[PDB]
Every structure is written in structure tokens, then in C-alpha cells.
Design a protein around this nucleic acid. Structure first.
Ligand SMILES: [K+]
Ligand SMILES: [K+]
Ligand SMILES: [K+]
Ligand SMILES: [K+]
Ligand SMILES: [K+]
Ligand SMILES: [K+]
Ligand SMILES: [K+]
Ligand SMILES: [K+]
Ligand SMILES: [K+]
Ligand SMILES: [K+]
Ligand SMILES: [K+]
Ligand SMILES: [K+]
Ligand SMILES: [K+]
Ligand SMILES: [K+]
Ligand SMILES: [K+]
Ligand SMILES: [K+]
Ligand SMILES: [K+]
Ligand SMILES: [K+]
Ligand SMILES: [K+]
Ligand SMILES: [K+]
Ligand SMILES: [Mg+2]
Ligand SMILES: [Mg+2]
Ligand SMILES: [Mg+2]
Ligand SMILES: [Mg+2]
Ligand SMILES: [Mg+2]
Ligand SMILES: [Mg+2]
Ligand SMILES: [Mg+2]
Ligand SMILES: [Mg+2]
Ligand SMILES: [Mg+2]
Ligand SMILES: [Mg+2]
Ligand SMILES: [Mg+2]
Ligand SMILES: [Mg+2]
Ligand SMILES: [Mg+2]
Ligand SMILES: [Mg+2]
Ligand SMILES: [Mg+2]
Ligand SMILES: [Mg+2]
Ligand SMILES: [Mg+2]
Ligand SMILES: [Mg+2]
Ligand SMILES: [Mg+2]
Ligand SMILES: [Mg+2]
Ligand SMILES: [Mg+2]
Ligand SMILES: [Mg+2]
Ligand SMILES: [Mg+2]
Ligand SMILES: [Mg+2]
Ligand SMILES: [Mg+2]
Ligand SMILES: [Mg+2]
Ligand SMILES: [Mg+2]
Ligand SMILES: [Mg+2]
Ligand SMILES: [Mg+2]
Ligand SMILES: [Mg+2]
Ligand SMILES: [Mg+2]
Ligand SMILES: [Mg+2]
Ligand SMILES: [Mg+2]
Ligand SMILES: [Mg+2]
Ligand SMILES: [Mg+2]
Ligand SMILES: [Mg+2]
Ligand SMILES: [Mg+2]
Ligand SMILES: [Mg+2]
Ligand SMILES: [Mg+2]
Ligand SMILES: [Mg+2]
Ligand SMILES: [Mg+2]
Ligand SMILES: [Mg+2]
Ligand SMILES: [Mg+2]
Ligand SMILES: [Mg+2]
Ligand SMILES: [Mg+2]
Ligand SMILES: [Mg+2]
Ligand SMILES: [Mg+2]
Ligand SMILES: [Mg+2]
Ligand SMILES: [Mg+2]
Ligand SMILES: [Mg+2]
Ligand SMILES: [Mg+2]
Ligand SMILES: [Mg+2]
Ligand SMILES: [Mg+2]
Ligand SMILES: [Mg+2]
Ligand SMILES: [Mg+2]
Lengths: 134, 158, 263
RNA sequence: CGACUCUUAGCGGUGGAUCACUCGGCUCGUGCGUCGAUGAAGAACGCAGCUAGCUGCGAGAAUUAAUGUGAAUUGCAGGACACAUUGAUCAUCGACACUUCGAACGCACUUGCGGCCCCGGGUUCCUCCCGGGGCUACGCCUGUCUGAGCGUCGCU
RNA sequence: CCCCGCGGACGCUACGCCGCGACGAGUAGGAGGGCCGCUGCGGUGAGCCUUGAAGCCUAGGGCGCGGGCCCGGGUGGAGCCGCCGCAGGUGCAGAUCUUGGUGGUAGUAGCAAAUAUUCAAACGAGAACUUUGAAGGCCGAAGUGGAGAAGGGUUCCAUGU
RNA sequence: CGACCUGGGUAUAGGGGCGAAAGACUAAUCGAACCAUCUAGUAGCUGGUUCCCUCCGAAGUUUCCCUCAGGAUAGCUGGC
RNA sequence: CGGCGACGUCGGCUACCCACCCGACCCGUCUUGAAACACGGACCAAGGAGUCUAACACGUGCGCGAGUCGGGGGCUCGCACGAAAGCCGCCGUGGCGCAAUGAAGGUGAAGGCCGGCGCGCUCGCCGGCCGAGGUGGGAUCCCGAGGCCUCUCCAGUCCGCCGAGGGCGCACCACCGGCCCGUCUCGCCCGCCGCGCCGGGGAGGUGGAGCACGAGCGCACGUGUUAGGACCCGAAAGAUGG
RNA sequence: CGCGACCUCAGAUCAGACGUGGCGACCCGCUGAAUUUAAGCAUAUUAGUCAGCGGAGGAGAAGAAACUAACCAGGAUUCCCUCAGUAACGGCGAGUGAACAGGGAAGAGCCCAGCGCCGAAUCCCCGCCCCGCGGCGGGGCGCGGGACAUGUGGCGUACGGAAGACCCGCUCCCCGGCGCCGCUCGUGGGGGGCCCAAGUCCUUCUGAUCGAGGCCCAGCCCGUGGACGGUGUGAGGCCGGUAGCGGCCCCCGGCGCGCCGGGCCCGGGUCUUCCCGGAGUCGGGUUGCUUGGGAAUGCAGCCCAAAGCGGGUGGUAAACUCCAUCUAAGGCUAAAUACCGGCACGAGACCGAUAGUCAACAAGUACCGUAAGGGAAAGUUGAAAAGAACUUUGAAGAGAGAGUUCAAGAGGGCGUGAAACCGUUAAGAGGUAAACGGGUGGGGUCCGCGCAGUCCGCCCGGAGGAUUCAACCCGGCGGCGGG
């Protein structure tokens, strides 16, 4: 269990840090698991959600195998918007339904120089841990 | 009001005592903090004894305690003179010295100088420059026998 | 509570000729608070009766001979199956209740081999009872960081720590105790004797040196000796059925005489 | 027969108890233990595209730079932003900047008024007007310059 | 020396069970018991619970001398309780008690100081009260007129609601 | 037409002011303003003091007290 | 032993409404006396008053016991729990208890019997023993003549029950002695490196919160008293500074 | 009768510096009550406390004896335990009340003035050059100024010191860098950044699931990680984290070595000869306050006013006498200790929106007072706004439909939704105000699987099935007994 005397297990404190988190760590909070193929291709498990990667919803009303591209990462509300995850409202227009990034798996990563740097960053640390506990 | 038999009690609680109450909830924390300081000090003086300087043999003053012997503040200047130790060198080699203590009897003086001579024999002196030993000690025994002594140096013993 | 709570108002009583209770009243106007009662334990926003104070004497000192004698009772109860079962420790298939394992356990490093040991000593059912007991606490403790509760598991007693603490400690209910530093709070978790204790052989052998025999004083406590029995043979049925007792008795009067209806 | 009144029950009001929750307190403990004339604390007034409060900020005004970070901010709009002839956002914060009062400092304030030295313009050097910049408080230390004394003397 | 029958109720949480006899008012006050009740902590119930917790409602079924408790039905929507110990900011009808809410009073008292209004039209869903016109009155220059100081601070002026 | 009325500016501040004097006035407060604190001031005096059952069950008398609406003391009560 | 039982009846003293007979004044409070023409109370909800600390006293529970107690400190990976727990012993310093009495100087708690001797002078030197005396009660325990037994007797083999009397006597109580300290009265001896305004001893009264083969210490709980805001609310006032 | 030196003063927007004000929990210096208790009250107590004024720092203050003692002596200060509710003070009433010794925490000692010696050996400022910048220092230079003999520096301070001889030991200091250690340490020294295990597996519950069953090989997988939080439930394996002497990157500090720049300059023992101290201070009288300090503990005002084998203290005033102990009237000093303010953290048998801070929220806000100052109330739709399109009546508020949702019998002060009180419906009743206790009766809502009313042990009889009933054999396991 937790032994570090400088990290708190207080429920009020953890909730306060979570809901008042700055956007640059709200990104880390809003991470998603990768698919089994991606988790095998890269030696990484989770990844912060990105604007233009495409995921499938695994929990809720919109569960299925359909692949939808992320269209908005709305960090203030801790939700992401996906293409076809939407509903009709009263006056006939469509509104995106925000779902938590922990309830999707990333099937494909929007890859730029920065993601690739983070991807090999995480994999290298995992490999060090594997050879430490060998 | 008095009620039947009892002890005439005089509590001293007429003086707004509740504004000056010393709780002891930091006592466990205080014991931890002093123990860290003790351990840090011992590491800082790595081979020197942790408790500190050797203290003299001292007889307790009054007629209640004058059968009992304890440790004093420091060795007297007369004790150092007949032990052959300069009063300014002694503090550099772990001998506490009290300039204001006199020796009214020879037995107390003579007991403390054997304490000094014997401590001098037990003392291992490191050269100021380890490469060049002038008169410190032989490197054969100062290497392996050098160990930080725990507890009071030569504890005073009735 | 705060020493200032309910007493930072400057309120005063209105007197007696104003058709209101003589309680102190908040001075001023232009706010709801004006003219409201203050300072009283019966007043909303007032001071509580006898405010709780930090010098309540939270701690108690217990005589050392008391405390050593609680440990001895706790240890003696942990070797009797009826008492350990009555604590609900599922010691059904345990080979022997003064349960002792080889010193090799002290050098365990992984949780897997700690789990495997408990299964092979038939102590795993106790752990599964701890798992079944994991639920939420009832009441305000959830708001006060005591969200989760669970049953107590077996107690592992060791002489040395060569990794045994790290190997265990992720197993719910398992508490590890050094034999030289026994805690009555851990041996009798609720004040009830009979906790299941698995002993390491080195810890088991040090037990005589730690508390002594009735013919040896403890060699690691410098002044302690085992408490003495005020009743050597606590077998009431055997004592009462002994021919010495039975010879001295009068015959039992087993006929019941019920009230006679006065005809 | 109806009205009215009373009791009970169903439903509906009024009201906000109860229960559950808690980014708040209270208490204890720990480590540090740092303001200011290089203008503090405090106050005032301003600063957002849409902005009253709160919050943040100071005419570079809901922020500049720098560094870390790595695609957002978001109520709406707008426009950015190859993320490499370097970057949204957030965090940090060491560069820069920091209005007026306030110990508050040219004098004075429920107002207003000066003086000195430079620079620019109307002047077309001589000093009037306008603007800009820098100075102009009290006490006190060392030193400097200028002095005072029928204070003590020296020479003439 | 039981044996054609191999058999023979219950009991004894010993802090339990059983028998017999006498007795039973009570303020102030004292003591005992409480499987009475509230909140939290250590144990324990391989406890309960989205197949519905707490709370609340109930012409529903019962238990206890009683404090109270269990069960059915409804509502509700996420927690809760039994037992052994531990610890209290632990039980209300009163205190001209505190805070909040609500009645009767009661559609009642009242909307009566300074003479006074009326006709027609317009807008408008809607006119005793707005606007225009007409008439009758009042302030009567020490004004119910026209402008300032103090104080207020946008109340000023248009348009709209 | 006067010891006349009145605006504004000034001065006097709490045991102090001011008073042609009423203990008047001193911000609806005056035989001692108002504000905060000492302060949860003291009260032998008034009011209140929260669940059940079971058992026992009073005194208003003695002595002393600046004692007479209160205590101490003995008595009466309960518990062990 | 009889009758009666499904869409109409059967049972449910509880619970809802109603009727009748009898009984029945509104609680709380002070008080000799309240339904009072005595005060508070329109109604409902939530809140609301013997608490905590310290110090005593007694009772009860626990550990150890002439001891007891580590509470301050220190040692143990420095810390999830754990600010806990464990340990110290030349850490028991110290506290309380184990000795009292006097203002103090100070002094400071063992007797009983048997013998020879001065003079067994109300007495001094020893011996030997036992180790807090005695009287009257005194739970319990011990001995116990004599009884209780068998299908019967001459004759004892083993133990059980009742038992008049007798004995040792716990705790405790009453009383009589004895011992320690203070203080009076009387009186005679003894001791010496200090021969003294020195030191010690005796008998008889009397003062003491004493001795007389310890009971205390620590922890917990309850009750009672007290100092603290002190069960809760309540002055008229006083003071300081604005 | 002018010019110079000095002394004592003055001015300057002179060159360069410093102080002011805030906070104030803790600390230091003053000032300083009354409520209260004494059952009244004045001394006393409250209390050297509240209020008032001044001054600091991360601590402050104190502090290296003009001490304690009376011993076989201890030995600066501060803090803890004890001494001890004691000695003592006190209308000796109520009440008040230390210290020494002992045991611990910590432990650290020193510097001037004076007396002397040394050619003022001393210090500040200003120019010039070099090494540097990182808080501004070092070196060299100046017939460059000033301070200073009305006294700077070195030596030296009661523990004695100095100077000469004699003997002995040459013995080794502190400062800022160059490169690198041990890698600084209970395994980084600190600060910051980014990372590191394992189920969203099968079947099902649901609006949603984190729920419920299951996952062969001793058992789904990880576990040095089963703290916590988030996510539509209630999650060790979905996510962030958590564990780890785990990884990587960035920045900063004192630690040893070889060198560098410069300083850096004799120490001890014996003998001899010398030298040695703080004054309107001590002390005394008196007055006031203070203390446990009692014929006067301390502090202060006024008067008197020292000495040097002296002075102070030795808890009863005084004289004489011996003894003990320290050496005042100058200065510095870390640690152990304090901390209701501040920065940043951790935790709790605490409170849970009338509670807990006044303040869970645009709270010291709204508002009140001329002002000093006083000072609230106020949390909750839903998982997601999906926040009710559209039709219809009305001028609109507001309705009826429809629609979203698991639910609007959740519709923007919206979770639950009590009581008082009110409307309506249903039933019953009603001239002694209602209400109540006891006893019945009537009606009504419900309950009773009410509605032909128990079960089960043995035996008898009838009609059917099944092995196998007993006894023997083999094996296993128990209970009891055994020199
Ligand atoms: K439980
Ligand atoms: K009951
Ligand atoms: K329910
Ligand atoms: K005038
Ligand atoms: K006054
Ligand atoms: K009277
Ligand atoms: K009444
Ligand atoms: K201790
Ligand atoms: K002792
Ligand atoms: K004595
Ligand atoms: K009390
Ligand atoms: K004021
Ligand atoms: K005393
Ligand atoms: K000079
Ligand atoms: K992780
Ligand atoms: K004097
Ligand atoms: K002397
Ligand atoms: K409030
Ligand atoms: K506030
Ligand atoms: K709802
Ligand atoms: Mg409150
Ligand atoms: Mg609850
Ligand atoms: Mg309703
Ligand atoms: Mg920038
Ligand atoms: Mg003017
Ligand atoms: Mg002159
Ligand atoms: Mg009775
Ligand atoms: Mg209460
Ligand atoms: Mg009530
Ligand atoms: Mg009317
Ligand atoms: Mg009218
Ligand atoms: Mg007219
Ligand atoms: Mg006009
Ligand atoms: Mg207008
Ligand atoms: Mg009170
Ligand atoms: Mg009061
Ligand atoms: Mg009298
Ligand atoms: Mg009365
Ligand atoms: Mg009354
Ligand atoms: Mg009367
Ligand atoms: Mg009455
Ligand atoms: Mg009457
Ligand atoms: Mg009355
Ligand atoms: Mg009322
Ligand atoms: Mg009334
Ligand atoms: Mg209540
Ligand atoms: Mg401990
Ligand atoms: Mg002792
Ligand atoms: Mg006797
Ligand atoms: Mg006697
Ligand atoms: Mg008593
Ligand atoms: Mg008075
Ligand atoms: Mg009084
Ligand atoms: Mg009184
Ligand atoms: Mg009085
Ligand atoms: Mg003060
Ligand atoms: Mg200052
Ligand atoms: Mg200091
Ligand atoms: Mg000092
Ligand atoms: Mg000195
Ligand atoms: Mg004592
Ligand atoms: Mg005092
Ligand atoms: Mg020490
Ligand atoms: Mg000199
Ligand atoms: Mg993970
Ligand atoms: Mg969760
Ligand atoms: Mg979880
Ligand atoms: Mg980590
Ligand atoms: Mg004397
Ligand atoms: Mg509140
Ligand atoms: Mg609520
Ligand atoms: Mg309307
Ligand atoms: Mg619902
Ligand atoms: Mg609602
Ligand atoms: Mg109704």
C-alpha cells in the first residue's frame, strides 16, 4: 500500500486535486488504453487521448465495434467527442455525447514527432522495469 | 462547602490557568527529532565518540549524595597539570576541562589523573594529513581499531 | 472545537422589560443576525455546552506486568482450536495450531510464493474469508478516510526480516509481527483472544527465552517470569467425578415437591 | 337534502424536516520560518471582443519574455496553431515591466501650487508658451566644501 | 452373573434450570436491570443490498408491563445493520428557550388631514386612474409658479417592456 | 428691533464638556453617551434540566454561623 | 356429543369511524395547599442544559507485593496502521509505602520462663531456651466416651454417620499488661582519651495522627466534595482602550 | 591688524550610506486594572494578568559565577522529571509559594578596558593598473587626502600575564579556484520535469454498470504494487496513481586528492625579575513598588557616599572573631527550548449545511451605524441538457397534447420530501366546547391459500415393487482395556 509520507490518501484532497487540476495534467488524467494490437506493436499500455485518433466505445449505450475518430477533447468536462457518438435533441439537430476517455480503447494513434517520443519513452521505461524484475 | 470528613484542599486554579496549558502531543515527535539529531551528530564526528568528551569522576555535594559518585563538567587544571596535558590541547582530543573546579583532596585529584592517563592510552590519534603521519599513531591499529564509541566514555561507576 | 467558536459576537442581553427571553442578543441592525440569541448552547450559532478541549487525557498507562500478562494469555489462547475457531479463522484443515514453519519462509521475496505457502499450509481459506468480508463501512467513517473494512486474517510471526514482510503485506488480512515486539493490539484484534498465528521456527524457539518457563526466568526481560495458575486442574467434570469427591458427598435430592392443594 | 363543524383515510398543495452525499471546517503533528525608501502591508482607480461580481493583472493591464509541456481554450464568436526556417494550452517562473494614494518623500490636499537642470516644438536663443525626462522629505554616520565665534593661541 | 427385545423422553446458555413461602403506595432522594434507543471505533456475522440501502408514508400483521422492536405494502435511489467489547457533543413539552416554518384572528382592522370632478375621442386584449380636446374647479406671486445652496448620484433624456 | 431668528465655518468629549440651572443637553440613549474588550463578570435569587421498568424511601427538627429566602452539624435515607 | 361452512359467510378483545353506560378540571412549576381569578405554554420541525481537567476520600475490579511504579529520558528500518507496540536495570534519580514523636535541639518502638548470688533490696552480672504477653468471647479445625448397621449369637477382624464432653483457636471486639517519642513527680546508680553547667539508665502519672511478625504501590471504574465558565440562561454594576 | 593653527559650532538638493512603516502566534523592555474570591469589605486575591506603549529574530532572552554549598563538595546558560503544593508568605483568613542538591536533553567557550612592550606597528576614503564580477574582494602603485598620541593595531585578561635565561620539540594554519573521486547518504544531499505490472476475458443484472456466476493444470493475471481518487455501481488488473537501495533528463550546495594566488610564523617545561583590573559604582539611610524572601528578595527615586590583606555572599537585626566562597559596577557566544501569525505538507475513534470557522456558495460579502464598530442568509436536476421540437387556447402569465429520460409522481432555488397548516374526494357523526380512561355494541378497511380443517410413531389387514434382512468372509476406520 501507500508508504510515501508526502502523497496523501485523503479522499477530499484527491478529489480536490482532480476537479481543480490544470489542463496540462488533465491531459494525463484523460488517458485511454490502447488496443491489443497497439499494445503489442508498442510496448505501452495507456496513452493520453489526442484530438485526431480513432477509438471504439467499450462501455455505455454507445458500445460497439464501430471505429470513430475523436473530434474534441473537452478537458474542462473530462469528456471527449467522437464522430458518430451523438444523439438527436428536441429541435432536430445533433449534439455530440461526451464520454469518458477511460471507456474507450485507441485503435489508431494520431502520430507526430511528439507522440512517437512519448511512445518510445514509455516503452523504454517498461523495458527497464522488465529487465530489473527479470 | 465542606462535607463530612475530608482533606482541606487548596487547588491553585484561581489564576486563569487554561490560557497557559502545555500539552505533550509533540512528545513522540520530539523524541524522534532529538534521535535524528543524535544520529546526525554521530555521523558528523565519524570516529570520535558519539556521547562526546570524557568527563571527570565527581563526588556529589550534599550529605544525602556524598556516598555517590557521578560525572562532572570537566577535568580540573590541576588534574591536567600532573597528567601532563596542556589545558588548550585537551579540548581538541576529547578531554573536557573545567577551569573553575579545584581539588580539595588528593584522592579525588589522584583518581581523576588515572582516568586521564588511562584515557590517553585508549586514545587513537589520526594524523592531520593522512599521507604524512608526524606523531599521530601507527596506521596498523588506527585503520582497523578505529570505531565510534557509543555511550559515555568510560562511564562513571560506583 | 475552536476555543473561539460562538464567542466572537459582542452580544448582550436586552434586559427584562421587552417581552423577550433574557438570552444575549446580537447588537446592531440591517442584518438577519441582529437581535438573535447568542453565546448559549441552546442558541443557533452559539457556543456548545462544555466545549471539548485538547487536554482530555486521551492516553492511559497500563502496568508492564499487566501488559506482559495480556500477551501470555493471548499466546496461550492461540494454541487452542476452540478459541481460534471461535474467532472465525477457518482452521479446519490446518495440520497443527501451534503452527510452525521452517526458517526458509523468512527469506521469501515474492507475493506468489507467500500465496503458495498459505495454500499449502491450508491457511488460504482464512484469506478468502477476508476477501469475502471486504465491504463498505456504514456511517460517517466513509467521509473520514475509513471507507473500507475487512476481516482480520492470520498473523505471521517472524524472528528475522529477510524479505518476508515484503513477500506478504499485499495479502489482505495478513499482519506480520516480530516475536521480540509482540503487540496485544494485533494478537487480540478486538480484545478477544484467539487469533490464528503462523510461527516461524526461529521465532518459536526464541519464545522460551523471551517469556521464560515456570522454572526459568526470561533471559531477554531481566525480571519477568511466567504468571502462576490459581487453579492447576481446570477440569471441573473430572474433579467432581473423582472418587475422593464422590465419597464425601451426600445423596442427591432429586424428587420435586410441588405445592399441595389444601383439601 | 344540502351548508358548516369534527375524526380518519386517498390524492393534491404549503413547508423544508429527515436521510444519503461533501473541492468546507476543527484539532493534532511535521518541515521551513521569507516584508519595506531597490517603496512594504493596506487602499483607490483602471485592464477582457462580448465581462457585473469573484479571481487575475497594471497603460506591455483576465497579461510580455523565458523554461518545461505537447494540441488545445470553450458560453458564443473570431482568428490562429506545418507541432521543424519551432508550438495551442497549461505549469513553472530566474528576464522585463509594474498606474495613483499609502512609512510616502518638492509644498498641499473633501483643493491646488511651486523651484532647479537638461531635451524637443512654437522660438527662429533670449528667453516667454507647450510637451518630455531627471531632481527637490525628515533624522542620522563617515568624508567634502563653504563659513561663524570680544573660545584658546601663534606671527606680523 | 440383565438379555426372546441390546433398548428407554426432556434436561444442566451452572451468568443455567427447578421448587416452596411471604410480600408489592410513593414526592425529594438513592440503587439495580434494560435482547430500551442515538452516533462513532476495535473485532465478528464467508452479514444485508440496484433482483433495491438509508429516510419517509401507511384503515396492513404482530411482539414487549414498558422504553421500543420485527414483518407486509408504497415511495425512494446507495448505502446499512445484528452480536462481543470500546467511547460519547447520546434520548425534550416546557426554560416570556434559539432558529425556521405555519395557523385562528380575517377576507377582518383598514386603504377618511389639505373643496372636485365630468363628457367625447385615440392607442390598447383590457381604461375611474394613460394621452388629446372640451367643461367645471383649486394653488392665488409669503404659489401647488420659476431657479439655486446642502444632500442624493444618473433619479436627467429618448425608445422599449 | 431684539437678552431677536437662522445657514455655513470653527472650539469645548465622558466623571469630561456645556448649561439665563430643568440634573437640562451632549446623534430617538444622560442622576454619567456610544463602541470593543476584561467577560461565559458574580448571584444565598427566578426559570428550565431530555428513555423505560424494578427495589428502598424522607425532612421542614438539634447546635453553631452579620445566621432569619443560605450553610455547617446531628437526626431522618439509600448503597456496599 | 351436536350444528355450520365459498362469491356468501366464518374468526381476528389489537388497529379506523360511530353510539351508549360509568369514570373523568390542563399540563409544567414554586408551594402547607393549584383546576385555580398564581406564573410559562397559539401550533409544528430542528437545536437545547451535571461536561472535561486537576486534587482528595471511600467502595469495587486487575497486576505485583515489603515492595510498587518509568509517567521524564534513552534504544529499537523513521513514519500505512505505528504519534502505536516492545525493550532498558549502574536508566528506580525520584514518588508513595516500609517509624513515630517533639516547637526544637534531638530521641526513636521484644518480651516470657527456669537458676544459682549481692540482700532474687520490687532488684543488678550471666546461663539456658522460645520469640510480641494475658483474660473473655470467637467461624473453622482436632480428639472424643457412647450410639446407628446385616437371618441370629460366644469373638475381633476394615473403614462411614450421629455424638455428650474436651482441645488448638483465624479474623474481629471488649479489657488488662508491655514497648517508642513529648512533658511532669520522685530517686538512686553507671560510663570515660574529653571528669564535664558531660553522657546514659530507673520508678510512677500523663500528651501522641505510634509499636505490638507489615499492606502497600500502580492501573481502571463508580460515587461524593472542591477549584476552574463548572448543569444551562439571566443582572443593577466595575475596569481598560477607543 | 591682517594672516594662520586648533577648539566648539553652522549650512549644503555636497560624495557615499543607514533609520522610519507592516506583521506580531512565539520573544524582550515598560505600564498596568477592575470584574472575581474572601459567602460583607478596605490589606490580600484576581495579577505583574487583561487592556495600553516601545523593540526584535527565525527563534528570542539568558549565559560562562562578586554561584551553589557547608559536603568525601559541586561548577556558564536554557529545557524536562523531581524537589513540592514543600521551606516560606498571608485580615497566618481566603489564598499564595520558590530554590539547592539528584536524574536527564544539550553541551562550547571566550573578548576588551586597565597594567606594559613594540619608531601608529592601526583604520577609512579617493584616483591608476591587473586578476575577477556575480552580494563586489584580492594584489601592486600614488612627496594622494583624512581619522588617530584627548590612543589605532599586535601580544595579553584572573584558568594568571609578560620579559629574560636553560632545556626540549621543528613538529604545519586557515582561506577562492583548476580536473576528478567516495559519488553528498539507510542506501539522490536538495529542487524541478517525464516515465515504468496485471481482464475491460465468457455468460448474465442494469439506464449505466465497478454487480453476480466462471476462468483445466492447485487453480484467470499482477502483486516489493489489494493506499486513494476518477470513470453512468459497488474496480488491485479501464485511467491517474500506489511499490520499488526503479529509470532518464535539468539545475544547485559543503565535503579529499595534485597544483595554483597570496597570506601563514615558534610552541612547551624549569628558574629568575617584573605586572595585575571596570566609581555618583558599591555600600548605607529613606521612600514606593515587587518577591516565598520573612528586622526588609529584587527594582527604582532622593540623600549620604567608599575601600584595596579590599569588596560581595554565607536566608534573623547587631558588635567581636575565625572560616568558606566568589571577584561586581565592560562585551560576545551555538545546542537542547517557545510558536493560536506566515509558506508548504501529513493525519484524525472530531463536525457534517440551525453542525463545523462568521464564512463548504461573487463572506468579512450583502446590509446597518456619522463613526469607532456590528455583520448575515444562502450546498444537491440529470449518467448525459438529452433543459421539452412541433400542434392548440389565451394579450400574456399559464394550460392541454406531444417529446427526452430508467425516472420530470427529477422541468433551471429542480435528490429525498416529515410535521404544523390548507384544498378536494370517500366514510361516519354532530343541541350540553372538544379531547380522554374502562366496558361493550354497530359499521368499515384489511388479514387468515378460513371455507368441509392436523400431523406422525407403532401395530393389524389388503394390494404392488426394490434389493438383499440376519448371520458369515475380506478390507478400512474408530472407541475402550492391557502386567
Ligand atoms: K460491524
Ligand atoms: K419491548
Ligand atoms: K423502504
Ligand atoms: K450666525
Ligand atoms: K461616564
Ligand atoms: K425572616
Ligand atoms: K397559566
Ligand atoms: K517512560
Ligand atoms: K523506590
Ligand atoms: K524528625
Ligand atoms: K463542577
Ligand atoms: K471605540
Ligand atoms: K505550606
Ligand atoms: K598615526
Ligand atoms: K502505474
Ligand atoms: K535605595
Ligand atoms: K571575604
Ligand atoms: K452562521
Ligand atoms: K467572512
Ligand atoms: K427523483
Ligand atoms: Mg456553532
Ligand atoms: Mg445513518
Ligand atoms: Mg402533501
Ligand atoms: Mg510566454
Ligand atoms: Mg482651499
Ligand atoms: Mg579667535
Ligand atoms: Mg413500589
Ligand atoms: Mg447535549
Ligand atoms: Mg421541542
Ligand atoms: Mg372593511
Ligand atoms: Mg376607509
Ligand atoms: Mg382661488
Ligand atoms: Mg419652486
Ligand atoms: Mg423621466
Ligand atoms: Mg453559565
Ligand atoms: Mg452575564
Ligand atoms: Mg460573627
Ligand atoms: Mg423560592
Ligand atoms: Mg413556579
Ligand atoms: Mg402562599
Ligand atoms: Mg398545577
Ligand atoms: Mg381561585
Ligand atoms: Mg414567578
Ligand atoms: Mg413558545
Ligand atoms: Mg402567555
Ligand atoms: Mg430533537
Ligand atoms: Mg513506547
Ligand atoms: Mg533512592
Ligand atoms: Mg483471643
Ligand atoms: Mg492496654
Ligand atoms: Mg466524601
Ligand atoms: Mg466597586
Ligand atoms: Mg467578596
Ligand atoms: Mg456571594
Ligand atoms: Mg460587593
Ligand atoms: Mg497584553
Ligand atoms: Mg519597528
Ligand atoms: Mg541572542
Ligand atoms: Mg547576553
Ligand atoms: Mg570570569
Ligand atoms: Mg512529596
Ligand atoms: Mg501572586
Ligand atoms: Mg546527555
Ligand atoms: Mg593597547
Ligand atoms: Mg496501470
Ligand atoms: Mg469508484
Ligand atoms: Mg479503484
Ligand atoms: Mg514512485
Ligand atoms: Mg544569622
Ligand atoms: Mg454555518
Ligand atoms: Mg439537511
Ligand atoms: Mg402575471
Ligand atoms: Mg423516481
Ligand atoms: Mg424535490
Ligand atoms: Mg385531507
Amino acid at each position: 500500500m501507500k508508504f510515501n509520507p508526502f502523497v496523501t490518501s485523503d479522499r477530499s484532497k484527491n478529489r480536490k486535486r482532480h476537479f481543480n487540476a490544470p489542463s496540462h495534467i488533465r491531459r494525463k488524467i484523460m488517458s485511454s488504453p490502447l488496443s491489443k494490437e497497439l499494445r503489442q506493436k508498442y510496448n505501452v499500455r495507456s496513452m493520453p487521448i489526442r484530438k485526431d485518433d480513432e477509438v471504439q466505445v467499450v462501455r455505455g449505450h454507445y458500445k460497439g465495434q464501430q471505429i470513430g475518430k475523436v473530434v474534441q477533447v473537452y478537458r474542462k468536462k473530462y469528456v471527449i467527442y467522437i464522430e458518430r457518438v451523438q444523439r438527436e435533441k428536441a429541435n432536430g439537430t445533433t449534439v455530440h455525447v461526451g464520454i469518458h476517455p477511460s471507456k474507450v480503447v485507441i485503435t489508431r494513434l494520431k502520430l507526430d514527432k511528439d507522440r512517437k517520443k512519448i511512445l518510445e519513452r514509455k516503452a523504454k521505461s517498461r523495458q527497464v522495469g522488465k529487465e530489473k524484475g527479470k | 462547602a465542606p462535607s463530612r470528613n475530608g482533606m482541606v484542599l487548596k487547588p491553585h486554579f484561581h489564576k486563569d490557568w487554561q490560557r497557559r496549558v502545555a500539552t505533550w502531543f509533540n512528545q513522540p515527535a520530539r523524541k524522534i527529532r532529538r534521535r535524528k539529531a543524535r544520529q546526525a551528530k554521530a555521523r558528523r564526528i565519524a570516529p570520535r565518540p558519539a556521547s562526546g568528551p570524557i568527563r571527570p569522576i565527581v563526588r556529589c555535594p550534599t550529605v544525602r549524595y556524598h556516598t555517590k559518585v557521578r560525572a562532572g563538567r570537566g577535568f580540573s587544571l590541576e588534574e591536567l597539570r600532573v597528567a601532563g596535558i596542556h589545558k588548550k590541547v585537551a579540548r581538541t582530543i576529547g578531554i573536557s576541562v573545567d577551569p573553575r573546579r579545584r581539588n580539595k583532596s588528593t584522592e579525588s585529584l589522584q583518581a581523576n589523573v588515572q582516568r586521564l592517563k588511562e584515557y590517553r592510552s585508549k586514545l587513537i590519534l589520526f594524523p592531520r594529513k593522512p599521507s604524512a603521519p608526524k606523531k599521530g599513531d601507527s596506521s596498523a591499529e588506527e585503520l582497523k581499531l578505529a570505531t565510534q564509541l557509543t555511550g559515555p566514555v568510560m562511564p562513571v561507576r560506583n | 472545537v475552536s476555543e473561539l467558536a460562538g464567542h466572537q459576537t459582542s452580544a448582550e442581553s436586552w434586559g427584562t422589560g421587552r417581552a423577550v427571553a433574557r438570552i444575549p442578543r446580537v447588537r446592531g441592525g440591517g442584518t438577519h443576525r441582529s437581535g438573535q440569541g447568542a453565546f448559549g448552547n441552546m442558541c443557533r450559532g452559539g457556543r456548545m455546552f462544555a466545549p471539548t478541549k485538547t487536554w482530555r487525557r486521551w492516553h492511559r498507562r497500563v502496568n508492564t506486568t499487566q501488559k506482559r500478562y495480556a500477551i501470555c494469555s493471548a499466546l496461550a489462547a492461540s494454541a487452542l482450536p476452540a478459541l481460534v475457531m471461535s474467532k472465525g479463522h477457518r482452521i479446519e484443515e490446518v495440520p497443527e495450531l501451534p503452527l510452525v514453519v521452517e526458517d526458509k519462509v523468512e527469506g521469501y521475496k515474492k507475493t506468489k510464493e507467500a500465496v503458495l505457502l498459505l495454500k499449502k499450509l491450508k491457511a488460504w481459506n482464512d484469506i478468502k474469508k477476508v476477501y469475502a468480508s471486504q465491504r463498505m463501512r456504514a456511517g460517517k467513517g466513509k467521509m473520514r478516510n475509513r471507507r473500507r473494512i475487512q476481516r482480520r486474517g492470520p498473523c505471521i510471526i517472524y524472528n528475522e526480516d529477510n524479505g518476508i514482510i515484503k513477500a506478504f503485506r499485499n495479502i489482505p488480512g495478513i499482519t506480520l509481527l516480530n516475536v521480540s515486539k509482540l503487540n496485544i493490539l494485533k494478537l487480540a484484534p478486538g480484545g478477544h483472544v484467539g487469533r490464528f498465528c503462523i510461527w516461524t521456527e526461529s521465532a518459536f524457539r526464541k519464545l522460551d527465552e523471551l517469556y521464560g518457563t515456570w522454572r526459568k526466568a526470561a533471559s531477554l526481560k531481566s525480571n519477568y517470569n511466567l504468571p502462576m495458575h490459581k487453579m492447576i486442574n481446570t477440569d471441573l467434570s473430572r474433579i467432581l467425578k473423582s472418587p475422593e469427591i464422590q465419597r464425601a458427598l451426600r445423596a442427591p435430592r432429586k424428587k420435586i415437591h410441588r405445592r399441595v392443594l389444601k383439601k
